[PDB]
Every structure is written in C-alpha cells, then in structure tokens.
Design a protein around this ligand. Structure first.
Ligand SMILES: NC(=O)c1ccc[n+]([C@@H]2O[C@H](COP(=O)([O-])OP(=O)(O)OC[C@H]3O[C@@H](n4cnc5c(N)ncnc54)[C@H](O)[C@@H]3O)[C@@H](O)[C@H]2O)c1
Ligand SMILES: NC(=O)c1ccc[n+]([C@@H]2O[C@H](COP(=O)([O-])OP(=O)(O)OC[C@H]3O[C@@H](n4cnc5c(N)ncnc54)[C@H](O)[C@@H]3O)[C@@H](O)[C@H]2O)c1
Ligand SMILES: OC[C@H]1O[C@H](O[C@H]2[C@H](O)[C@@H](O)[C@@H](O)O[C@@H]2CO)[C@H](O)[C@@H](O)[C@@H]1O
Ligand SMILES: OC[C@H]1O[C@H](O[C@H]2[C@H](O)[C@@H](O)[C@@H](O)O[C@@H]2CO)[C@H](O)[C@@H](O)[C@@H]1O
Lengths: 478, 476
C-alpha cells in the first residue's frame, strides 16, 4: 500500500521540496501519497505546482493531495509532519515590539539560554495550542500515526505533546550539523570522526569528539590558539567558532553546537555592541535587529522567487526545473535558489533533513543514526524522565534506540545550563496547561530587564489584548 | 561528656547553651570548653558562665582555650558558632560590592538575601568549616560536628560531602510556625505541622489542626486581619505582604528566614523593601534594618564585658545579688539584669543543641528540625544536598520524618532548584579554586552591567589583606 505522509505548513517551500525530492530518491517509499496542507492558499498552490513539476520531471510516482483542513491531512496518515508557525513572522514582530516598548530588549520571549528569535515559548499560546490540537486529532483520527515536530519551539512543544497526548511523537532538527563545520575547519575526514551530542533542542553539546582512536578536543584547542584570531562569520548564523562559542567551550568543557551558541546567558546580549563582540561583525549574530532583519529579508526573497517559479511553470509547461537560471536572474537571491534546485534534482544527493530517512528506517528497516528529540527516560543523567532531550539514536523497524551518552555531559553543563533552561521550559508548559498568568509574571519578575511590577503588568496586558489572542486572554483570566 | 564550642565569644548563643545545660540533669557532670580568638570576649563569657553555674548549683566544668586543637580533643560534641572575619569583614566586602553597583553586596542573591549568609566572598569562613571538620576526623573521629554558624546550607553540604564525620546543622527559623499558630488563636498541641526545604528555605508543607487542613484558617486571617498587620522589629516578617505573596504563588507558607529569601522583586530598592516587609525598616536586610540588628549585637557584647568586670570586682557576691553592690547606679544594675535576661528569657529560647545532645546520650527523645544529607527525603533533590527537615532524635540517632504532603512542585522547581544551583556554584568555586564560577554567578546577576564591573569587584575583594590565601586559591 501507499504510505501516507501529511505536511502541516507545507507552504514552507524549501522544506517541502526537500522532503518531496527525498521521497522520490527513496526506493522503499516510492508511490507514497503526500498531502500538503496550509492556510495560505497561494503558498500552498505554489508548492503543489513545483512539487508536481518535480515528480514528473524526475520520473517518480509520488501522488499529491491538497487541503486547508487539518482533518484531511491527518485522516489515514502514517506520518504527520508539522512545520507550521501560527501567526507567522508578523505575530513574532508585533509581540517583540510590544516587549521593547516596555523595556525588554529583543522581546520578553528572549531569555537566558533561549535567544533564538523565532523560538517563542510564552507569548505564542496559539502555536503551543496548535501542537496539542494536532496531536489530539491524531489520537482521535489516526492513533497509530507518528507526529513529527519540525516547528519551533521543538523543546517545549515536544515535551508538551509527549507528556499530554498518548501518541508517538518525536522532534527533528538540523542543529547538530555544526559538528561538521568544526570537523572541516580542523581538516579532518568526517567518516574518521567519532562524535556524539546531547542536551535539549538548541541546547546541545559535543559530549564526545574523537578522531583516530583519541580525544580530538586537543585539535580544536590548537585551532583556537593558532587560527581563531582570523575567524570571521560569513553570515549572521555562522557562529559555530565565534568568541561566544569558544568562551562557552572554555567554561563548560565541551563545545555548544549549532543554535546552542546563540542560546547563551544575557552576558553576550546586553546590547548590539556586546552582540557584535561575541558573535562577530557586522551583524552581531542572528539575534540582533540587524542580523534578524537580514534573515527576514532572505525569507521574503525565497517566498518571492517560489511564487515566480510557480507562475512560470504554469505559463511555460515545457520548461524544465533543470533549466533553472535562464528563467531566473543572477542576483544573490536567485543564484542561491538555483543551487538549492540543483541539489534536489541530483538523484544521488539526499537533502539532509531527517524526516524521510526516519520514515524509511521505521518502515523498511534501512537503519541509520539520527539526532532526535524524545522523552529523556534516564538517557541524560540528572534530568527528569519526561523532559524531552535531543540525543543520538539508532532507528530501525523496531523503533528508536537511544545511544548511551559517553562521555556523559560535564556536570557544569547539566547544573548551570540545562537545569535553568529546563526550569523555563517548565514555566512555559505550566502557564500553558494551567492558565495561571502568575507563572508568566514570575518569569518576568526574575528577568534582569524588569524594573518594576507595573512594567510586567503592562507588557502582559498589551500582548493579551492583541486581536489574535482573544482565546489566550480568556485562558489566562483569573 | 565534653562539649567544645568554637566562637564562644558569641554571647547570646553561648549563654543560652550554658543556661540550658544547667537545666538538663542528664548532662550534669559535663565539661564545656569555650574557644575563641578574641581573648576579651572569651574571658567575659567564661566569667559569666562559671558565675551562673555557681549560682544555680549545677555540676559543670567550664574552661577556655584559644586553640582549635584543644577544644576538639576529647570532645564528644563540637559546636561551631564562629564567623571568620566577623561583621567587620562582612561590611567591608558589602561596601566594595555597593561601590561597583551591587546593592547589599554581591553575596545578596535571589533566594539568599540574609545579610550575614555569605557564600562566595567568605572563602575564609568556608575553609574554617572544613579545617574544623578535618581536625575532628583526625583528633576525635567520633565527635559530632554541630554547625550553628552561617552559611548552614552551603557549610553543612560542604562538610558532609568532603569529610567522613557526623555533622548536622541547627537553626531557629522554623519557629515562625508558632507565630502563625498564635496569631490564628490555635491550641499548639492540636496542631500537626511539618516544614521541609533547605536552611532559610523551608516551607510549611503540612499545617493541620484537629486533623483538618488549617490553611483555610490562615486564609481567613489574611482576608480579615492582614490589613492591620505591622512588624514589631526588622525580623518580624512571618506574616508580612512578602510572606503572604510567596504563599499565594507557591501554595505553602515560607517559614522564618525563608521570607527574607525571596527573589529580587521584593528587594529592588529600599522603598520596595518597605512595601513588602513593612514600615519603618524594610525588613532585616535593608541598611536600616541591618543596622538595627548590628546595634543589638554591639549592645550585647558591651553588656557582657561590663558584667564580667563587676563579677571580678565582687568575687564573693552571687550573680543574682550583683545589683545589690552596684549601689545608686541603675545603669550597672540594669546591665546585670540584661545578662540574666539572656540566660533566662521570659519564654524558652528553643536552641536545639543541648536537647539534641541529651536526646542522643540519654535517649530523652524529641522532635528536631535538622540539616542533614537529603538521601531521598525530599523528592527531586540530589542525595548529597543537605536539607532542613524534621526528625525524631533518640539513642539510636537521627530519624528523618517522611515529608507528607510532599512540597508542592512549584517550590521544588522554582525555588529550591535555583537556590541549590547557587549553593553548587559556591561549593564548586571553593573546592576547585576556579574564579570563573564566581564570575559566572555575577555575569548572570541582574545588577551586572558589564564584564569590567565583574572583574573589578572581584579583584578588590581578593586584594583585601585578610584574603591573601583566598586570592592565591583562585589564581591561574
Ligand atoms: N524558516 C526556516 O527555514 C525554518 C528552519 C527550521 C525550523 N523552522 C520552524 O518552522 C516554523 C515555520 O517556519 P517559517 O520560518 O518558514 O515560518 P512561516 O510563517 O513561513 O510558516 C511556514 C508555513 O506555516 C504555514 N502556517 C501558518 N499557520 C498555519 C496553520 N494554522 N495551519 C497550517 N499551516 C500554517 C504558513 O502559512 C507557511 O506556509 C517555525 O516554528 C520555525 O521556527 C523554520
Ligand atoms: N544558626 C543560628 O540560629 C544563628 C543565629 C545568629 C547568628 N548565626 C551565625 O553565627 C555566626 C556568628 O554570629 P555572630 O553574629 O555572633 O558573629 P560574631 O563575629 O560577632 O561572633 C562570632 C564569634 O566568632 C569568633 N571568631 C572569629 N574568628 C574565629 C576563629 N578563627 N576561631 C574561633 N572563633 C572565631 C569571634 O571572635 C566571635 O566571638 C555567623 O555565621 C552568623 O550568621 C546563626
Ligand atoms: O532562528 C531562525 C532559524 O534558525 C536556525 O536555523 C538556521 C540554521 O542554524 C542555519 O545554519 C541555516 O541553515 O539557516 C537556518 C534557518 O534557515 C534554527 O535551527 C531554526 O530552528 C530557526 O527557525
Ligand atoms: O541575619 C541575622 C540572623 O537572622 C536570623 O536569626 C533571627 C531569628 O530568625 C529570629 O527568630 C530572632 O531570634 O533573631 C535572630 C537574629 O537574632 C537567622 O535565622 C540567623 O541565621 C541569622 O544569623
């Protein structure tokens, strides 16, 4: 039979096309039916146009279905992948501005160890509620389907779903590929490196880093001593080897990986100039207003180009996606988009997203190593059983088999980084589940940016008064 | 039985143990060795102590020593009430912190506002706890180490994790329960209560009366009488707005010093302290309230020196008759009465050290609130973190109570865990000598504005003359 895979938030083109192309490149999953769902009809139609073109151009037999309805993407599904962001970037920025208006630089959701700009955990009640609503619908309509959480917040979200809805659920992220930048900068062969990461999503550490039967951190130490002085970031997100990362490594004893670097204490984020010092010129990292605008702009351009490409495919039914950049111009935006298209068109190249390989491991026993977000259940020492952690695991027809963490994470990481980060995840979930507004007020009473009780009352009142937050306000009413 | 007391110059503490020892028939015949480095305060307490013993006719031998080894050898119990550096060092360091923008000093942290409860700048104090403990292990391995000196939480956790001797911490904070009982008008013998947490971080997890939940009675009091509440002194904050507010969030009442140990919300500035802890002092941890307390300490020491002098000037006179020889001088007669008041207050002191010793040696069993390694008593806390919980003590030792109902999750997750993390920082800095731990505490402090501020406040504290070994310890 045809494996049914549903994608919520399918309008996110690059992601959907990566999943679609990976499926086409996976023998055991050929013939699958992909239901694409979104609330934005234009973005939805655009991805359907491009995905259908792709499948035909490459000779695949993948079938598609379109819907704007949650029930249709879930009914009969074997896997449900959620990449939706309720409220979009417009909601994120309106809230951030309200925060800054009341003295909270970068918004109230930016907290010690969670500076990632689109990783809201308190003001995005609607996003958290959608995760739960999807999970409950899966429980009711397709009880044996897997819920694959791709949207942020992955840590809070996956913990919330696994603790409250009895379905199979896992979160997936690309964060760990930061390991590959370190390996390449040290001139080491990836296949010769024995690595392991552990922590929570966007809060992971390189607990094991060996090369040729020995601890390889000395090689990183050599790189820091001899070459870090010449280090420069290529874009706002290129901070794996920034002063912030190195300094965290020096204190904790292991390297923070990926977005974990952005998720430092307030020390590296007191102001723009401080951000530039730790994350590099000219942006001050992805989470400054400069760096975040850089990001928002690239996203806008990607959506523009997708819409253009879709339009053109419909008007020029004979054009081939491989005739890319003959239709598209040559500005940075377009050239990058063509590189992406070429990678998805290459039959021997997988995208790197873990969703499809995960499905193939489970259904066809093509086992592989994954970095997954699952309930801890003792994997990481010192963390509660029901806290979702991000760790490596072998996955096969018999399911997810967590690796043993070794060497274990250093005590400093567990005691001084993960524990406070978990405490704020616990507050976010307790506020969400109980509707007790004093949990959110407590988070702000302890926030270093808070100067008075009036400030806390006002920022909360304004966020709860936004039109899209009517049910959130009622949920929090005493 | 030999009992050694380190820091015996701590007048109130010493005279209260003297008084209780005299009233404990089971410990008659005991030898008490008083030790301090301040010869003057030491002689005064020894002079008053022997004079009191004579008076009431108790059978106790009191001696003094300025030597740590002598107070420990042959001892069955070693009680530490000493504060290395004294209040002088405390204020010296606090002034430095404030110079660099840390109101009330860098040791004032979320959930640890108690002004004399230093945990990072008082390296010398922490090292003494360990030095005392190692000597006990060396010289009198079977002695019990009883810690009265602060910080009890960090200190007792430090000692129990590193030295294999019997150690327990004792405090009087839990008595806040009695104030609640009295204000609600309840018969004490009908109240079934329990507290649990860490030292100066305990909560009334159980509060029942005649078998039913008694919190509704506190709710009644809050709703009908709190608006008329006013504190009698800077420390009288058990039923303050701060306490009530913590109770409303956490679900259980914070007890004793726990009330002082709130988040920065109630301590942003003096006016905020007044709002939460009451007029006119703003609690014991404002500059006004703390000064009020410092004044009481100075007064007590002056009193004991004046009286010790009179005792020597009038060798044949009994303590209770000393006023009789000071003639028309009411001030001097009042000094003697002041001292007698310390020895025999109108209401019992409640100090647990003597009862504890009597419980262990003579099996005169009782309920105590002790600081001991957790070992699963409080769920969610590591086995080697020292907690403050109730226990039955008898000939067979300490018998911890089962905590029931358990502390609410909010208390464990949002109060104890962060508090414990800072205890872990304090201990790691002390044990490893890695100054980056102390810098990390300050990088996260809401009062910190820059790296240079952190470097300089730490450098100045490390450059004090009393801190040469501390500076050496944190080097490299
Ligand atoms: N931007 C990225 O490349 C990226 C990478 C990794 C993870 N994520 C996470 O994925 C989520 C979305 O990513 P984004 O930045 O492209 O945001 P986005 O606003 O573009 O959301 C993407 C898709 O979600 C759809 N959507 C919104 N509300 C929906 C609803 N109620 N039901 C179904 N679909 C809905 C949108 O219309 C859109 O097509 C966020 O939580 C984000 O943090 C994004
Ligand atoms: N557990 C409780 O119930 C409780 C109650 C009040 C105070 N305290 C604690 O008791 C300690 C002292 O209280 P205090 O206000 O009297 O302080 P203090 O400094 O005035 O007196 C303590 C005594 O320590 C002595 N001392 C200093 N260094 C010494 C050393 N190296 N060896 C021996 N003795 C030494 C002093 O000379 C002094 O007589 C502090 O840590 C304080 O926080 C605890
Ligand atoms: O905060 C935005 C987005 O950032 C991260 O993803 C980055 C990734 O780290 C970069 O290496 C590059 O691949 O672009 C990504 C965004 O396209 C977070 O991992 C992600 O969750 C977050 O939404
Ligand atoms: O911070 C000084 C001192 O305060 C507390 O002791 C109080 C006690 O709680 C009161 O009940 C009353 O007895 O006065 C004491 C001060 O004399 C702390 O409990 C103690 O540890 C601390 O040193």
């Amino acid at each position: 039979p045809s494996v049914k895979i549903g994608i919520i938030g399918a309008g996110s083109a690059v992601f959907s096309l990566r999943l679609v192309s990976d499926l086409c490149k996976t023998p055991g999953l050929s013939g699958s039916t992909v239901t694409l769902m979104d609330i934005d009809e234009e973005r939805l139609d655009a991805i359907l146009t491009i995905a259908k073109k792709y499948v035909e151009e490459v000779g695949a037999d993948l079938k598609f279905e379109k819907t704007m309805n949650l029930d249709d993407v879930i009914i009969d599904a074997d896997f449900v992948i959620n990449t939706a962001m309720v409220g979009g970037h417009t909601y994120l920025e309106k809230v951030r501005q309200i925060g800054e208006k009341y003295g909270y630089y970068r918004g109230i959701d930016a907290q010690e160890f969670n500076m990632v700009s689109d990783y809201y955990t308190f003001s995005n009640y609607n996003q958290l509620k959608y995760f739960v609503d999807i999970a409950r619908k899966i429980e009711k309509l397709s009880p044996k389907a897997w819920y694959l959480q791709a949207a942020n917040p992955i840590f809070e979200g996956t913990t919330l779903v696994t603790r409250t809805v009895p379905i199979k659920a896992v979160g997936f992220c690309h964060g760990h590929y930061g390991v590959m930048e370190i390996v390449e900068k040290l001139g080491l062969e990836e296949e010769k490196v024995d690595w392991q990461v552990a922590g929570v999503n966007h809060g992971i550490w390189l607990n094991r880093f060996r090369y040729n039967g020995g601890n390889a951190y000395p090689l990183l130490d050599k790189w820091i001593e001899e070459k870090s002085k010449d280090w420069k970031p290529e874009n706002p997100f290129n901070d794996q080897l920034s002063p912030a990362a190195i300094d965290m490594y020096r204190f904790y004893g292991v390297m923070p990986i990926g977005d974990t670097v952005r998720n430092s204490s307030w020390r590296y984020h007191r102001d723009l100039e401080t951000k530039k010092k730790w994350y590099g010129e000219p942006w001050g990292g992805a989470d400054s207003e400069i760096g975040w605008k850089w990001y928002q702009d690239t996203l806008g351009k990607v959506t523009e180009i997708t819409k253009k490409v879709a339009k053109f495919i419909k008007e020029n039914p004979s054009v081939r996606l491989s005739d890319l950049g003959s239709v598209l111009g040559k500005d940075l935006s377009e050239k990058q988009f063509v590189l992406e298209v070429e990678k998805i068109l290459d039959p021997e190249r997988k995208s790197g997203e873990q969703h499809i390989p995960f499905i193939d491991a489970l259904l066809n026993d093509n086992k592989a190593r994954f970095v997954v977000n699952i309930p801890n259940k003792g994997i990481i020492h010192g963390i509660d059983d029901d806290v979702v952690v991000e760790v490596p695991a072998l996955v096969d027809k018999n399911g997810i088999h967590p690796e043993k963490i070794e060497p274990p994470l250093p005590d400093r990481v567990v005691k001084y980084y993960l524990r406070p980060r978990i405490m704020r995840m616990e507050m976010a979930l307790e506020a969400f589940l109980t509707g007790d507004i004093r949990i959110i007020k407590e988070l702000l009473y302890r926030d270093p940016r808070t100067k008075s009780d009036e400030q806390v009352e006002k920022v909360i009142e304004e966020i709860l008064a936004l039109p899209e937050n009517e049910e959130m306000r009622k949920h929090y009413l005493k």
